[PDB]
Design a protein around this ligand. Structure first.
Ligand SMILES: Cc1cc2nc3c(=O)[nH]c(=O)nc-3n(C[C@H](O)[C@H](O)[C@H](O)COP(=O)(O)OP(=O)(O)OC[C@H]3O[C@@H](n4cnc5c(N)ncnc54)[C@H](O)[C@@H]3O)c2cc1C
Ligand SMILES: Cc1cc2nc3c(=O)[nH]c(=O)nc-3n(C[C@H](O)[C@H](O)[C@H](O)COP(=O)(O)OP(=O)(O)OC[C@H]3O[C@@H](n4cnc5c(N)ncnc54)[C@H](O)[C@@H]3O)c2cc1C
Lengths: 316, 316
């Protein structure tokens, strides 16, 4: 096997990885970026994007990522198609083992993301990008003054339902259990919106099917209750599956400090904000952010990571 | 006078103000944005921008800001051309006095920036955007393998000279004093680059003139020493005036916690990262960031501020 050394190595080809690559390349660091299996990241799984600032019309997730790829290669970023399966971050240089070889580096930017999970239903698969969504902040404004359904039982699902009730005419929260596995302040606000307004609760229901026409989702078929096969039918314009994200950090367990699988960074207002618990290793994007989860915040921390990496590499 | 109330008010029309406006508008908050005197912010004072991610070619600062304005107005952001001169943030709703009236709001996003200072020389005025720059991270890659001059004596100037020595063939640091008003770790690294390389020091010199041709800067004329009018002439491709920034926060003194004029935010990885010392008041952009100072990091915190504001306005 081969062993390639780089001063700076970037893991991930989503908005955080690519912005860190254009800032590192314009700092004359000659960055090497490893793409992972999902070349272009999570945005290649969506259709229209209208909250990337400065792109009012006609943008899709694939088109933004094609442009980001162009930007990085313009500044001669070395892009390798490989995926990392093992890491040693306790010796110098850091050693990373991929499928096509070994990589060592003096500084590392981890931008591996936190991918959305779906239900696995064929009717859900059918309507992705045309009515089924996994991000309410992203797509909730398309369903303004319309009926919407959210499915899930954790913190994310109550958060998405709560955000959506200020946009949609009504929100239908669907869950298998007879209660939510969410935060105290979230369930207080939820029950206030249930009693004095917008959110219709649907506990002890499971999602059987996503129905729709040629243009998209028009309904959702539910079933069960506490002992009976009741079956409900709901007229809805969009479904927001909110069952959780999977931070891509199993490879870092026992190496870096994690917080529910998310990489813990230093943060703060005094610099070196993207540094993880190991000096020389930095993180950017959704892998270190479980609150905002946007392409613009991922590009912002990607930039911070490249400048923190440059300052580290120069003894500051 | 008029007194207009808004649920959410945004101050500033730079990248942070406009991104907070598109995220607030797509959250159905109907944001009101007040532009300030400098409509479009600091980026309207520069020429080519090639580190806004996903825009590899043909972008200028004015064009990005024209597009951001379009994006905000597409989502019906109410834009007011006015400037705030007095503020009361200790009573509810917050009261802000402008030149064309009074404004009250339930949540406030401050995105007023930190403007760069120049020397005030007519020859410097002449070459702005074509050889004279105030941001080395921004424009340093255009002067790769070329000679460059930085003028200033504080932390910023030593930081800019240090960053530039990895790009430029040589860096000429110019200062009036016989020493730098900078950090301990910065001056150690500076003196290492002075002795073993790239940085040529020019203490007890002042800048008399910026010379150049039709395409841009080709030189710099210096004068003085400790008792003598020596006059040096330097062949250089770019001048980086690094004498400091002015956070636009005089209006907030005694109201919010400041740190060398920069608004202190909560930061962190657990949400509500842009909140200042007052609940309901948030900050984004260069006004709260003295480390990275980029349009992409300003747009990223603009987004965080709008989502923090939305969560605040909804009792979370
Ligand atoms: C349905 C949906 C719609 C969305 N719509 C929007 C929208 O309209 N606007 C918006 O702002 N945001 C949107 N988002 C959120 C946005 O997709 C994410 O915030 C953003 O993509 C995160 O960027 P990232 O670079 O952190 O990670 P990701 O884009 O997740 O990319 C992670 C990268 O890391 C690589 N990687 C993973 N593991 C390894 C490994 N072991 N070795 C090497 N590489 C590895 C992957 O292959 C991938 O390239 C949406 C998300 C979803 C799921
Ligand atoms: C010479 C130069 C070149 C640069 N080039 C680049 C580049 O290539 N790429 C890059 O990423 N970054 C670049 N930058 C940095 C970039 O300009 C800033 O990071 C960014 O503009 C900051 O955005 P902001 O929204 O925080 O504030 P600003 O853009 O500074 O805008 C502040 C806004 O607040 C308003 N305001 C101020 N006071 C008041 C008040 N009292 N009432 C109401 N409104 C008020 C102002 O009118 C203005 O609209 C450059 C900077 C300079 C100076």
């Amino acid at each position: 096997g081969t062993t390639k050394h780089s001063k700076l190595l970037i893991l991930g080809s989503g908005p955080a990885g690519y912005t860190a690559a254009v800032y590192a390349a314009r700092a004359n660091l000659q960055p090497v970026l490893i793409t992972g299996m999902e070349k272009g990241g999570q945005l290649t799984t969506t259709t229209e994007v209208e909250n990337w600032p400065g792109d009012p019309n006609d943008l899709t997730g694939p088109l933004l990522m094609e442009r980001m790829h162009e930007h990085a290669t313009k500044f001669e970023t070395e892009i390798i198609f490989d995926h990392i399966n093992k890491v040693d971050l306790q010796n110098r240089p850091f050693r990373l083992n991929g499928d096509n070889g070994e990589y060592t580096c003096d500084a590392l930017i981890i931008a591996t993301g936190a991918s959305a999970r779906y239900l696995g239903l064929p009717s859900e698969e059918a309507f992705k990008g045309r009515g089924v969504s996994a991000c309410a902040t992203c797509d909730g404004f398309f369903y303004r003054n319309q009926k919407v359904a959210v499915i899930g039982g954790g913190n994310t699902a109550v958060e998405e339902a709560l955000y959506l009730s200020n946009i949609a005419s009504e929100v239908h929260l669907i869950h298998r259990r007879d209660g939510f596995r969410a935060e105290k302040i979230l369930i207080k606000r939820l029950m206030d919106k249930v009693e004095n307004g917008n959110i219709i609760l649907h506990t002890n229901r499971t999602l059987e099917e996503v129905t729709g026409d040629q243009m998209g989702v028009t309904g959702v078929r539910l079933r069960d209750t506490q002992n009976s096969d009741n079956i409900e039918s709901l007229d809805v314009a969009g479904l927001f599956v909110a069952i959780g994200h999977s931070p891509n950090t199993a490879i870092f367990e026992g190496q870096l400090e994690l917080e529910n699988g998310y990489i813990k960074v230093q943060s703060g207002i005094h610099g070196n904000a993207t540094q993880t618990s190991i000096p020389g290793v930095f993180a950017a994007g959704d892998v270190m952010d479980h609150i905002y989860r946007q392409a613009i915040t991922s590009a912002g921390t990607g930039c911070m990571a490249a400048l923190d990496a440059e300052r580290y590499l120069d003894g500051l």
